């Protein structure tokens, strides 16, 4: 089961349903497609990577690597995080 | 309230830094004050002498971000069995995307300049509210 | 040994996972479920290099330490336009703005 997350510039990111429910704001918008008018693809692709990262490493006994963020996307990514509550 | 018990019963421990951060070990003394100890570079480990019922916790030495030890916040040395040290496996937690973004913004922008960033006042306050050992201790109460 | 991928065609990006011992044909079956095109009308790539159906993902350089959750590796995807295969086209993401003076 998958869901389509759509950036402001038209990119269609397809991710698993359970991974997208990490964000409570997305949980609200669904409960198959969602459109983000304010989040461009270079920001939204990173959000999708964070979901994958959280689902793998949450309650994990292994070593956990850093989630990297390039300086050029930090301000925009922060604002997406605050909106999405993840 | 949160403090080490003065047991005087020895306990050998391995502080194993399995994180990318330089780690600051912090011992909570007999009055509950945090005493800082020598740092550990990423990927390194040390064998150290502590005592049963002593409270320890672990932070990033530069920024003071919180780290886990055996999946939790607090670590308490216990009874050694068969000449075998207790492992204190220090790791990163799964930070929220928001908190992780805040860390990255703090590392690039000086506290003087936070007000010059083009963001809502909610985020100014979030940036200013630095990680702090004293704050974390009052929560546990 | 899990690996984490971005399968990409035009302005579509599929986030999925597999093992190092998975075959390329199993990646096409995942694409079939989502985008509704059979394996023989798909063509998967690592950059310019075409990936044959019998090849495992480990052989083709997708490893658990390179293809990570937080930094997934890209697999290119091209469909057959009834008769013949289109050229591989993957639209770039948007560009971040210039860093301010304070960064
Ligand atoms: C009577 C008593 O319990 N006194 C306390 C002050 C004591 O001896 N402590 C408190 C903690 O349980 C540890 C122990 C000490 S001060 N052990 C010596 C020690 C010195 C350096 C380290 C560290 S921490 C990171 N690197 C090193 C070398 C660890 C332990």
Residue numbers in the entry:
A (entry chain B): 17 to 47, 58 to 112
B (entry chain C): 62 to 202
C (entry chain A): 1 to 103
What do the study authors state?
Hydroxyproline is the key recognition element of small molecules targeting the von Hippel-Lindau (VHL) E3 ligase, which are of interest as probes of hypoxia signaling and ligands for PROTAC conjugation. The modified Hyp residue is crucial also for the recognition of the hypoxia inducible factor 1 alpha subunit (HIF-1α), the natural substrate of VHL. Herein we report the synthesis of VHL ligands bearing thioamide substitutions at the central hydroxyproline moiety, and characterize their binding by fluorescence polarization, isothermal titration calorimetry, X-ray crystallography and molecular modeling. The new structures revealed that the noncovalent interaction network between the compounds and VHL residues was fully conserved and consistent with those observed with previous inhibitors.
To introduce the O-to-S substitution at the right-hand side, the Hyp hydroxyl group of intermediate 5 was first protected with TBSCl, followed by thioamide conversion to give intermediate 6 (68%). Boc deprotection of 8 followed by acylation yielded the final thioamide 2 (69%). In contrast, ligand 2 (single right-hand side thioamide) showed a greater loss in binding affinity (10-fold loss by FP, and 20-fold loss by ITC). An increase in hydrogen bond distances was observed for compounds 2 and 4 (3.0 ± 0.1 and 2.95 ± 0.05 Å for O–H⋯SC groups, respectively) compared to 1 and 3 (2.52 ± 0.05 Å for O–H⋯OC groups, on both compounds). We therefore evaluated the interaction energy of each protein amino acid in the complexes with its surrounding to determine differences in relative EMM-GBSA compared to reference inhibitor 1. The results, shown in Table 1, indicate that the loss in binding affinity observed in compounds 2 and 4 is largely contributed by destabilization of Tyr98 and, to a much lesser extent, of Tyr112, especially in compound 4. Substitution at the left-hand side amide was tolerated, while substitution at the right-hand side had the most detrimental effect, highlighting the prevalent role of the Tyr98 hydrogen bond in molecular recognition.
